[PDB]
Scaffold this active site. Sequence first.
Site, PDB file in Angstrom:
ATOM      1  N   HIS A 173       0.952  -1.073   0.110  1.00 31.39           N
ATOM      2  CA  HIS A 173      -0.150  -0.090   0.075  1.00 31.39           C
ATOM      3  C   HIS A 173       0.912   1.347   0.048  1.00 31.39           C
ATOM      4  O   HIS A 173       0.549   2.214   0.562  1.00 31.39           O
ATOM      5  CB  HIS A 173      -0.954   0.085   1.185  1.00 31.39           C
ATOM      6  N   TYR A 207       1.564  -6.127   6.630  1.00 32.54           N
ATOM      7  CA  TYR A 207       1.784  -7.032   5.474  1.00 32.54           C
ATOM      8  C   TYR A 207       3.177  -7.413   5.407  1.00 32.54           C
ATOM      9  O   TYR A 207       3.268  -8.502   4.875  1.00 32.54           O
ATOM     10  CB  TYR A 207       1.511  -6.162   4.204  1.00 32.54           C
TER      11      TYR A 207
HETATM   12  C1  LIG Z   1      -2.159  -5.010   7.360  1.00 33.37           C
HETATM   13  C2  LIG Z   1      -3.332  -6.172   7.178  1.00 33.37           C
HETATM   14  O1  LIG Z   1      -4.496  -6.029   7.210  1.00 33.37           O
HETATM   15  N1  LIG Z   1      -2.808  -7.639   7.139  1.00 33.37           N
HETATM   16  C3  LIG Z   1      -3.362  -8.609   7.004  1.00 33.37           C
HETATM   17  C4  LIG Z   1      -3.616  -9.459   8.271  1.00 33.37           C
HETATM   18  O2  LIG Z   1      -4.396  -8.671   9.184  1.00 33.37           O
HETATM   19  C5  LIG Z   1      -3.694  -8.440  10.380  1.00 33.37           C
HETATM   20  O3  LIG Z   1      -3.667  -9.529  10.892  1.00 33.37           O
HETATM   21  C6  LIG Z   1      -4.857 -10.330  11.358  1.00 33.37           C
HETATM   22  C7  LIG Z   1      -4.705 -11.784  11.674  1.00 33.37           C
HETATM   23  O4  LIG Z   1      -4.745 -12.176  12.572  1.00 33.37           O
HETATM   24  O5  LIG Z   1      -4.502 -12.232  10.269  1.00 33.37           O
HETATM   25  C8  LIG Z   1      -5.844  -9.813  11.701  1.00 33.37           C
HETATM   26  C9  LIG Z   1      -5.918  -8.192  11.370  1.00 33.37           C
HETATM   27  O6  LIG Z   1      -7.040  -7.865  10.442  1.00 33.37           O
HETATM   28  C10 LIG Z   1      -4.708  -7.527  11.210  1.00 33.37           C
HETATM   29  O7  LIG Z   1      -4.086  -7.298  12.418  1.00 33.37           O
HETATM   30  C11 LIG Z   1      -4.217 -10.786   8.120  1.00 33.37           C
HETATM   31  O8  LIG Z   1      -5.722 -10.337   7.531  1.00 33.37           O
HETATM   32  S1  LIG Z   1      -6.999 -11.143   7.886  1.00 33.37           S
HETATM   33  O9  LIG Z   1      -6.929 -12.675   7.420  1.00 33.37           O
HETATM   34  O10 LIG Z   1      -6.635 -11.341   9.383  1.00 33.37           O
HETATM   35  O11 LIG Z   1      -8.169 -10.377   7.410  1.00 33.37           O
HETATM   36  C12 LIG Z   1      -3.711 -11.750   6.662  1.00 33.37           C
HETATM   37  C13 LIG Z   1      -4.231 -12.945   6.199  1.00 33.37           C
HETATM   38  O12 LIG Z   1      -3.678 -13.407   4.974  1.00 33.37           O
HETATM   39  O13 LIG Z   1      -3.292 -10.592   5.624  1.00 33.37           O
HETATM   40  C14 LIG Z   1      -2.549  -9.740   6.505  1.00 33.37           C
HETATM   41  O14 LIG Z   1      -1.564  -9.497   6.057  1.00 33.37           O
HETATM   42  C1  LIG Z   2      -9.531  -1.670  -2.093  1.00 28.55           C
HETATM   43  C2  LIG Z   2      -8.825  -1.100  -1.148  1.00 28.55           C
HETATM   44  O1  LIG Z   2      -9.283  -0.174   0.003  1.00 28.55           O
HETATM   45  N1  LIG Z   2      -7.537  -0.979  -1.201  1.00 28.55           N
HETATM   46  C3  LIG Z   2      -6.596  -1.887  -2.122  1.00 28.55           C
HETATM   47  C4  LIG Z   2      -5.984  -2.979  -1.311  1.00 28.55           C
HETATM   48  O2  LIG Z   2      -7.192  -3.867  -0.931  1.00 28.55           O
HETATM   49  C5  LIG Z   2      -6.914  -3.939   0.571  1.00 28.55           C
HETATM   50  O3  LIG Z   2      -5.585  -4.587   0.867  1.00 28.55           O
HETATM   51  C6  LIG Z   2      -5.584  -5.876   0.528  1.00 28.55           C
HETATM   52  C7  LIG Z   2      -4.320  -6.345   0.310  1.00 28.55           C
HETATM   53  O4  LIG Z   2      -3.990  -7.579   0.192  1.00 28.55           O
HETATM   54  O5  LIG Z   2      -2.951  -5.474   0.464  1.00 28.55           O
HETATM   55  C8  LIG Z   2      -6.599  -6.589   0.379  1.00 28.55           C
HETATM   56  C9  LIG Z   2      -7.986  -6.143   0.427  1.00 28.55           C
HETATM   57  O6  LIG Z   2      -8.613  -6.276  -0.773  1.00 28.55           O
HETATM   58  C10 LIG Z   2      -8.223  -4.818   1.028  1.00 28.55           C
HETATM   59  O7  LIG Z   2      -7.911  -4.903   2.410  1.00 28.55           O
HETATM   60  C11 LIG Z   2      -5.063  -3.646  -2.505  1.00 28.55           C
HETATM   61  O8  LIG Z   2      -6.048  -4.165  -3.609  1.00 28.55           O
HETATM   62  S1  LIG Z   2      -5.906  -5.990  -3.681  1.00 28.55           S
HETATM   63  O9  LIG Z   2      -4.828  -6.259  -3.171  1.00 28.55           O
HETATM   64  O10 LIG Z   2      -7.048  -6.284  -2.766  1.00 28.55           O
HETATM   65  O11 LIG Z   2      -6.015  -5.956  -4.908  1.00 28.55           O
HETATM   66  C12 LIG Z   2      -3.983  -2.700  -2.989  1.00 28.55           C
HETATM   67  C13 LIG Z   2      -3.223  -3.399  -3.861  1.00 28.55           C
HETATM   68  O12 LIG Z   2      -2.005  -2.822  -4.161  1.00 28.55           O
HETATM   69  O13 LIG Z   2      -4.954  -1.571  -3.296  1.00 28.55           O
HETATM   70  C14 LIG Z   2      -5.438  -0.922  -2.302  1.00 28.55           C
HETATM   71  O14 LIG Z   2      -6.262  -0.038  -3.302  1.00 28.55           O
END
Ligand SMILES: CC(=O)N[C@@H]1[C@@H](O[C@@H]2OC(C(=O)O)=C[C@H](O)[C@H]2O)[C@@H](OS(=O)(=O)O)[C@@H](CO)O[C@H]1O
Ligand SMILES: CC(=O)N[C@@H]1[C@@H](O[C@@H]2OC(C(=O)O)=C[C@H](O)[C@H]2O)[C@@H](OS(=O)(=O)O)[C@@H](CO)O[C@H]1O
Length: 966
Positions: free
Chosen positions: A450, A457
């Site tokens: 981002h 991430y």
């Molecule tokens: C910045 C971000 O949203 N990263 C995503 C993870 O989200 C963080 O970690 C978790 C978690 O326990 O996974 C939960 C919270 O949303 C955030 O603190 C996580 O996304 S999600 O599955 O948790 O929605 C991972 C899953 O692949 O993607 C992260 O990188």
């Molecule tokens: C849609 C939005 O608000 N943001 C786009 C990103 O989407 C978020 O981040 C990710 C991610 O894995 O980084 C997953 C989820 O869709 C959203 O929480 C992301 O788009 S994408 O990965 O989903 O294609 C980035 C891509 O660089 O773009 C933001 O605009």
Amino acid sequence: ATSNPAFDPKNLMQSEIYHFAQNNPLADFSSDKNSILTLSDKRSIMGNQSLLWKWKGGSSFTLHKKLIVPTDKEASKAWGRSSTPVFSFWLYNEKPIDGYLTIDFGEKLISTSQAGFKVKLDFTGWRAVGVSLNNDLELGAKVDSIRFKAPSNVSQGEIYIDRIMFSVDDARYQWSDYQVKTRLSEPEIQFHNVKPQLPVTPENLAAIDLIRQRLINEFVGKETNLALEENISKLKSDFDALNIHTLANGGTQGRHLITDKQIIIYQPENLNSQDKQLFDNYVILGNYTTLMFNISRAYVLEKDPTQKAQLKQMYLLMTKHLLDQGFVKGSALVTTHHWGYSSRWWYISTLLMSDALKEANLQTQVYDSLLWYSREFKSSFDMKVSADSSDLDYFNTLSRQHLALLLLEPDDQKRINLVNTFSHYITGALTQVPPGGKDGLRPDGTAWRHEGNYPGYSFPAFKNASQLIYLLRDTPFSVGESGWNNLKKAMVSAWIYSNPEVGLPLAGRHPFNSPSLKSVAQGYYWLAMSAKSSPDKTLASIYLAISDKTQNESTAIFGETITPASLPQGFYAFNGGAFGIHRWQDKMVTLKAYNTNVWSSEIYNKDNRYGRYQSHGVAQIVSNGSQLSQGYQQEGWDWNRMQGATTIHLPLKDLDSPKPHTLMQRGERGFSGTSSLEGQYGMMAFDLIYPANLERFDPNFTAKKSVLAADNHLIFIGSNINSSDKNKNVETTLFQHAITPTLNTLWINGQKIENMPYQTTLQQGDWLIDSNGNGYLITQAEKVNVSRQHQVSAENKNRQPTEGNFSSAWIDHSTRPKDASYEYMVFLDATPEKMGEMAQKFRENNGLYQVLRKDKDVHIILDKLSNVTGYAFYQPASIEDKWIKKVNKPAIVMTHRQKDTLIVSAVTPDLNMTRQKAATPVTINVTINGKWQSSEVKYQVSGDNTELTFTSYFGIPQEIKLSPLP
Ligand SMILES: CC(=O)N[C@@H]1[C@@H](O[C@@H]2OC(C(=O)O)=C[C@H](O)[C@H]2O)[C@@H](OS(=O)(=O)O)[C@@H](CO)O[C@H]1O
Ligand SMILES: CC(=O)N[C@@H]1[C@@H](O[C@@H]2OC(C(=O)O)=C[C@H](O)[C@H]2O)[C@@H](OS(=O)(=O)O)[C@@H](CO)O[C@H]1O
Ligand SMILES: CC(=O)N[C@@H]1[C@@H](O[C@@H]2OC(C(=O)O)=C[C@H](O)[C@H]2O)[C@@H](OS(=O)(=O)O)[C@@H](CO)O[C@H]1O
Ligand SMILES: [Mg+2]
């Protein structure tokens, strides 16, 4: 299916579906002389029956259904995103047909009578068809006839049809395939190949089989996003519930498989109750493939030969069902977007079941299938390195899946070519400095997604990138040392900026849910053990610290005695996120600003709504351990009072981001960030400038905020503070933390305060200690409020009310309507006795420090405890100083005169790039007083003075040790 026309205004979004699970089911259907229709219960998609259509060549049947076909505009207004009306159905061939099925649409058609499309019939098993009625035919309001016409040029044949549907779908996701041409196409993978090629040799084949085994070992010996199930009873019970049965002359019958994204085509929320109930019998692919994976792990670990055999049969039957359900090469299934969420653990299960797939003769079909669906990921899977290849989501969610796919390639030479190319791809991805804000590692150790440094991430990417390097280690497919080195820098950096969670300023859109290095622990072992000279003692020492393992434990793990790392000490600059870290004993201080290249905050529709001040020159103190245990509690948190920030105290309705969806507010100039000297000392320079015209942002809110960090202390100074309203509600927060039985005591001027509520007002020469053992000596302020109070706040995702009891202290800048200022000093190891000593030193003509300049051009702080001077040049300037005479760019300069040497560091925290452009070095000329001789810094004596030439690349400080010339 109802008496109403398709796309009826009672509910346009209500799908009409011919599943035949109703009273009189062929009522709407008519066949010519040369066609026969029956219901078969042999196979079905929705309900227990499908339409068996026996035909002679060029005969038709007709579905009599009125269609009020909406415009794309109308469909889109009805759902709320870009949409089209879609015709879809499933069809099964027991044997391939060399010709085309024709679907015609019009008014009062019979066999012999507008627009239509072709389906190629050369296949077996289920296929889905789905077309836009507005965009994919070669449609007048009067359409009531859908005519299914068998191929002319083929003399007889047989087709099963189910789930003929009229629906509104997402206009992105009717994809072309080997059966139907739509306006949309996801092109197939075209693998890159690096020269020279590795030969097929016993050694190179053995290395490929070792990498497969190493992957199996990781998946059978704790994964986020994997719903692990080790109880065989539970696996058998979930499998039996699939009701899969092999059919005599081929295919299966069993519950229909659909992905989480495929369901959209039905518009499930709008289905009639009769269809919803049949739709509810579907299996979600993600669950199915997670089951395939859990069976495969159980199968690898199973010691009982009878159970082991059953577990293989279950996996191969699940595989046969998946393929017959149409998850095969050249079968779009209308769409498979977001494929990874549905299939990630299928890819992996193929590594565990690779010999079972070989012996069963399924390996080629499963490879072809997975390669075809992976075409969504073509930009990485093709393996040509590009500016986008360093994608941190790929490292987390796809990299091991990509490897698994390559290892499933049946030809040995092609497999080795693919994994050799994969190794080069990963090396380049982990080495290159992507341009502008593109994902990936950076040269200061930050790691971007981002378009900024983003631990949330990067942490999962570090885990899985280290694991990949470890899987390939000590083979002809090993990752290049350049990729290993760059990843080491990023992971050692993460160890420095986490304690063990990253601070609030590094939380991204997840304040109070920081990522923890504990989740990345194994990555440290993996990277340590994959060094060219393994183990890397630094990374091994960090693995033992983060995982709470003793030196006694080290020999068994690393094959030598390694002392667990002590917490890093000193100062580290990370201009990739316009931050720095000061470490002393078990504390970390995250100093954070922002600028044109560093967003202040990421705020989404339902994330970080009140995060405006996340990067406002904050200085969050964290001792090693849980931030929540230290009082960083979301409930009742005053979002205005982020520690160290200068802020306008706003009502939450006005602090909330003015964008309903996304705002990543960047700053108004390149310069703001930190610098370092001797790895021990730091300075933050923060130029607080707001946008000329963004709603809820006061365009005249300004401040200059510097911090000098050394040893056990930090000197905070501010100047030039202003707002549109004479600094009304302008404040600088000393600290904020929750009150709990363990966090119940404040000290103020030697007196313990435990009362709740409590208020008082302090000024110059007063001190306090928070419950976390941080002392704050007020050295220039007319008014500092202290509060122990119930607070009402709101949670950052859905703005729902919260409450909590908090201790806090802030400077009230409203006493100075124009160019307000402050100074204060923090002691990290404060005790009432030491704060008494520090207050006395301050009264003794300020023995602690001296501000040499405090204006809009320069801030200069002499730290008399450390004998270090920090110079925040907000503007190029000539100055009067013992050491520094002039700087020709915005910069941060630091000096230390020890014995026979002067050490000068310089940098610009400006990364000198855009969202698109590569960062390029900034040349800084620092003139110092006097004649010096001596690092990559160049110097030249010029009259009475010495010109130092610094090269600031990506905000990375440089320093030089000088000695005086006679
Ligand atoms: C910045 C971000 O949203 N990263 C995503 C993870 O989200 C963080 O970690 C978790 C978690 O326990 O996974 C939960 C919270 O949303 C955030 O603190 C996580 O996304 S999600 O599955 O948790 O929605 C991972 C899953 O692949 O993607 C992260 O990188
Ligand atoms: C849609 C939005 O608000 N943001 C786009 C990103 O989407 C978020 O981040 C990710 C991610 O894995 O980084 C997953 C989820 O869709 C959203 O929480 C992301 O788009 S994408 O990965 O989903 O294609 C980035 C891509 O660089 O773009 C933001 O605009
Ligand atoms: C009108 C405009 O350019 N607004 C910028 C945002 O981009 C829009 O909003 C979103 C969204 O998720 O809210 C996605 C689309 O790109 C646009 O409709 C956004 O820029 S960016 O991050 O999308 O490049 C923000 C970032 O602060 O800048 C907006 O105001
Ligand atoms: Mg049916």
